[PDB]
Amino acid sequence: REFRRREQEILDTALKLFLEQGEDSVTVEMIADAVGIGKGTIYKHFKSKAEIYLRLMLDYERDLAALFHDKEALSRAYFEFRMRDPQRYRLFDRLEEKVVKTSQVPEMVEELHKIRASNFERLTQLIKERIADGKLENVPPYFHYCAAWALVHGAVALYHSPFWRQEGFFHFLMDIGVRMGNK
Amino acid sequence: KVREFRRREQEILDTALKLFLEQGEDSVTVEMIADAVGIGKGTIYKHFKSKAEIYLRLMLDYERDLAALFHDKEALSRAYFEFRMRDPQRYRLFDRLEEKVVKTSQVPEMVEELHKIRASNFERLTQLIKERIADGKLENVPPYFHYCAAWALVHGAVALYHSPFWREVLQEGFFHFLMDIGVRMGNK
């Protein structure tokens, strides 16, 4: 458990330092110095910094997979998962070109693509159900999840524009996604 | 004489825009624009003294087009999202030129005007939202809840229209699906 605990403590501080100052800036030694562990004990978990990037994204899908385990309440919770903390989204967006596109450690890039596809396959099911219940305007479900993606992607860019300065607006965005494409 | 000059300028404009899309703005020069039209090397300089001037002129006519658009409210809200999502690459190109010649005030006489119409166009769409709120169709929240969410749907759609997914979305029905979403988003 203590090893399982330390692996999370490394990743929690890792992602934190990855939101403050640039993920290009933070080194493995910085993470090892920030967590309070040894400069060599950190390598007992992750073999490189790109491997931290990959697991940082695997738990994201592992959490979205847990969320998929009420059709309206769990549809709203989906947009909470995507639109909360848009800096995590923009970091993974940049990380998508560095470690995933350039399959560094292909073992995890392999695993990642699977849980993204499993998470992708768990979404249309909700879509076809909300369509089968006459709530979502009956269209090809590929119409829906593209519009859902095209709104969380634009909301992260919205939250990153010179427009930061907020809760009722966030709930207004969620009510948009739930009522989006509704019959 | 002003009509043939206003027409050749429009021809240079369409030719300059068609070449920035096919080839990218970073490789099209004034000489290539002036040759795909078929005019001399210095006659295109009688219209614009810089490719940057052509840059800001393209974004200026975009806002001029939008100014003529805000001239019913439900039919006006649709024609907006049509104007915004039509030709997403122009928006994508203008997203780049916003950093090249708008951030860097190359020819600041045009950047000043471009910022004033963007403020005048912003006042118009804000009144469209205020009109639909005060009338009673849109939910009575700050109009900033309405055009910020409207800005997000337009942004993520052109980013959807450029993803490796775009062999499919380029349709008429999914386009009309997004604009049903846009007009119905934020309703009471």
Automatic annotation (TrEMBL), chain A:
Highest taxon in the source lineage: Bacteria
Name this polypeptide is given: Biofilm operon icaADBC HTH-type negative transcriptional regulator IcaR
Ranges in a coiled coil: none
InterPro entries: Homeodomain-like_sf, HTH-type_TetR-like_transc_reg, HTH_TetR, MT1864/Rv1816-like_C, Tet_transcr_reg_TetR-rel_C_sf
Domain named HTH tetR-type: residues: 4-64
Alphabetized Pfam families for the sequence: TetR_C_33, TetR_N
Residue ranges of DNA binding: 27-46
Key words of the record: DNA-binding, Transcription, Transcription regulation
Sample GO molecular function, one term: DNA-binding transcription factor activity
